[PDB]
From a paper:
Here, we discover that human WDR26 binds the metabolic enzyme NMNAT1 and mediates its CTLH E3-dependent ubiquitylation independently of canonical GID/CTLH E3-family substrate receptors. Cryo-EM structures of NMNAT1- and YPEL5-bound WDR26-CTLH E3 assemblies reveal an internal basic degron motif of NMNAT1 essential for targeting by WDR26-CTLH E3, and degron mimicry by YPEL5’s N-terminus antagonizing substrate targeting.
Our structural analysis revealed multivalent binding of a single YPEL5 to both WDR26 β-propeller domains in a WDR26 dimer. Meanwhile, YPEL5’s globular domain binds the adjacent WDR26 protomer. As such, YPEL5 modulates WDR26’s accessibility to degrons from bona fide substrates. Whereas YPEL5-HA efficiently co-precipitate WDR26, binding to WDR26 was completely abolished in the absence of YPEL5’s N-terminus. Taken together, we propose that YPEL5 inhibits WDR26’s substrate receptor function by mimicking internal basic substrate degrons, thereby preventing substrate ubiquitin targeting.
Residue numbers in the entry:
A (entry chain 7): 119 to 155, 276 to 306, 311 to 629
B (entry chain Y): 2 to 120
C (entry chain W): 121 to 155, 274 to 629
The structure:
């Protein structure tokens, strides 16, 4: 006795077989099931839509899904393997003499800039086909070492800062490797952060002593703010707002044009550093003596707390990444690199290979399979998929 | 609506002298050698249910500072100020602390909190 | 092709299970195909798994979903996509009760959806009767005698009495007989008390009250004191269905449970921020929390874990209350300080609806327990808005 559910599947199978290019077994099936014409006219191509829906559901649950059409086999569930996720070392770059403090990819993911403890910033070019890194430029003259590096929005200039209690910053042009103005306002200043303006003609710098400037390419001072000890800066997309994290364990938005300020994040532990997603809605930040925290700026709400990173006093930088910014990468003081998916607070990988502490991690924005790791042992590691 | 009022707990509590809403306790006290406008003033560490107005720069007995005025959350009466920035390096230990005027607060005795059985 | 072969083989395997054999034989005889590598042998019941996956995906995107029949894998039509009827969703205001002469502070329903109790700053409590054949609210009686206003109202299990509290530093509470409209007892122990929270025992003859000065009593109908507890500054109270357990939230961000009969206490919840108010579900398993300077949180009372965090609501300066609601408790409703009402589905953190129409702060929101198409919202401007289905 075929119940109602059987009849629907029978009619769907008959329609599919008739439309596929066959005309005999459909009639033979109707002559045996004894049911055929909403119950008047079936929707066109129901089975194809149902199978596409099933494949979409299978793709939704895929975990290591970093990938960028009836090309999927229906006889087995679809799973992306871990050996395709970037978790295996592919290159070891040993050209710095003393140490490595900061590494950063270009905005188009074509070059890598690494700043060493000694007086050097090195630029590596990435081959587009074989994905190998080769040195092309070296920049010298940073007497106190390099701790922060920022790229121009069109990847024509980069600004390199020094360590704490350094009153200078450098501005180069990548095309010719020459040196633009070396800016220095006061001999007793301390500049340790820098952020570019989306128009690519102004930047904002600041420091722990209480300096917070907005300047141009020629080095002239356009604006200054008094009363804040900034630690990390980021200019928003609208070209007016600057988000700054202070020593009061909070993040505030400042408007230089109208000269206004508001609050967004209030925490209970020091904030070593923070970064902001592509759409300017979520902030991923590093908390001293704790893990990595995700904050929603529009709603001003703490979303998730990811656990597993050891960070007591030093500054450690993390990053977004993945197919559509679905993964979080970070370094730690226990010589390991940590990777999380946004849906859980437990790591999906714990990489290894560094002798000393790792203090910078970066994800390629245009190639979602390349990771760069910079540590205190003097080497850089390029991680990709398994061979 | 009904203003939400916090509580800090402990013994030797301080309260607003006008409406008697708690602000802090003796535990969060640093130094009592301070002067305000009505007389002696106290420097605390953490104070609850306060309000803040705006950043103002002024010259005090020790250098120049930028401060904010604080007031009670329930009665809207001024109680002191809170530091934001201090120019003199020596005067940085008080960067984020709160001063309350001793003539505008009242001391009271609060019972010891019941210690949870950890069950 | 090759995708066609897979479909043909899978269709044949599925058809062989419905008692048809001649059709399967002729299909394998004309197509040319045939039926632990998949080529060697086919997995068992693969088409059924694919169809169940498709139905599950259809259910996932259902916005106003009803989860009563989520255990029935079969008995869902495959010819058309599934979508629930939002016809009964309360997203359109249809009545504005304006009879309080000051700002309104609290709203509640009568445990069966027959009456609605409203308490405001103008020192009065108003009861509205609900017409069963029209869903129209009409004033029934007014209760006067309060001094500082009414901030919390608790209904009896049989809806024969109610208890009205006051704001902070109010040292007395009122117990009203609702059938005759008269006052039974106004209770006050000492002039230095503060009673802001009240809850009823499941037997309807005792109630536990408490405040932030260290008062935590259990009392009788006539106002006689029965039991006392020392050393806790309670803020919100709730009585479990067993009759001998009281859940109390304190100023240390805890929701600890207590037992008066043998004087025992436990540990349940531990939050990272101050707690304003909470409400437990119908079966006493889940707790819904309003957290200062944060969103609305959901906790499991047995596993003692956080389930979800709901965002979009602003709070921290005023006290705001929320509620469960909907058919089989699928939706969460709350007020906020930005002049609107937020509704969430249990499956997601982002809001579904943001109902505007209030001019000032929304303090409380109440769902009808037995009419799943009725909501009431009390605002900080003297209005109570009734929300029901769109025309
Ligand atoms: Zn995949
Ligand atoms: Zn006061
Ligand atoms: Zn549904």
């Amino acid at each position: 006795r075929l119940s109602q559910s059987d009849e629907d599947v029978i009619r769907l199978i008959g329609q599919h077989l008739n439309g596929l290019g066959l005309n005999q077994t459909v009639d033979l099936l109707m002559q045996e099931s004894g049911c055929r014409l909403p119950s008047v006219m079936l929707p066109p191509r129901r089975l194809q839509t149902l199978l596409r829906q099933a494949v979409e559901l299978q793709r939704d649950r895929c975990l290591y899904h970093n990938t960028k059409l009836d090309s999927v086999s229906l006889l087995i569930d679809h799973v992306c393997s871990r050996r395709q996720f970037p978790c295996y070392t592919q290159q070891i770059l040993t050209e710095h003499c003393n140490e490595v403090w900061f590494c950063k990819f270009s905005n188009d993911g074509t070059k890598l800039a690494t700043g060493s403890k000694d007086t050097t910033v090195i630029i590596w070019q990435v081959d587009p086909d074989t994905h190998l890194l080769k040195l092309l430029k070296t920049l010298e003259g940073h007497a106190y070492g390099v701790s922060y590096i920022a790229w121009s929005p069109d990847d024509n200039y980069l600004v390199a800062c020094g360590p704490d209690d350094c009153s200078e910053l450098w501005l180069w042009n990548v095309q010719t490797g020459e040196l633009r103005t070396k800016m220095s306002q006061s001999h007793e200043d301390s500049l340790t952060s820098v952020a570019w303006n989306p128009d690519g003609k102004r930047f904002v710098t600041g420091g722990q002593r209480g300096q917070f400037y907005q300047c141009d390419l020629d080095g002239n001072l356009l604006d200054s703010w008094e009363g804040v000890r900034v630690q990390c800066l980021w200019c928003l997309s609208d070209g007016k707002t600057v988000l700054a994290s202070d020593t009061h364990q909070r993040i505030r938005g400042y408007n230089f044009e109208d000269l206004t300020d508001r609050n967004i994040v209030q925490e209970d532990h020091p904030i070593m550093s923070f970064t902001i997603s592509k759409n300017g809605r979520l902030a991923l930040l590093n908390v001293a003596t704790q893990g990595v925290h995700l904050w929603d700026l529009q709603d001003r709400v703490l979303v998730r707390k990811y656990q597993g990173v050891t960070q007591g006093f030093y500054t450690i930088h993390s990053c977004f990444g993945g197919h559509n910014e679905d993964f979080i990468a970070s370094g730690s003081e226990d010589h390991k690199v940590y990777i999380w998916h946004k849906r859980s607070e437990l790591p999906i990988a714990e990489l290894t290979g560094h002798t000393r502490t790792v203090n910078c991690v970066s994800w390629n924005p245009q190639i979602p399979s390349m990771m760069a790791s910079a540590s205190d042992d003097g080497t850089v590691r390029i991680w990709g998929p398994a061979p | 609506g009904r203003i939400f009022l916090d509580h800090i707990g402990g013994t030797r509590l301080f309260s607003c002298a006008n409406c008697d809403t708690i602000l802090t306790n003796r535990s969060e006290l640093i130094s009592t050698r301070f002067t305000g406008a009505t007389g002696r003033a106290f420097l605390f560490n953490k104070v609850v249910n306060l309000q803040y107005s705006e950043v103002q720069d002024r010259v005090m007995l020790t250098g120049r500072h930028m401060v904010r005025d604080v007031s009670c959350k329930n009665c809207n009466s001024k109680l002191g100020w809170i530091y934001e920035f201090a120019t003199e390096d020596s005067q940085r230990y008080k960067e984020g602390r709160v001063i309350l005027e001793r003539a505008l607060v009242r001391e009271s005795e609060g019972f010891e909190e019941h210690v949870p059985s950890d069950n």
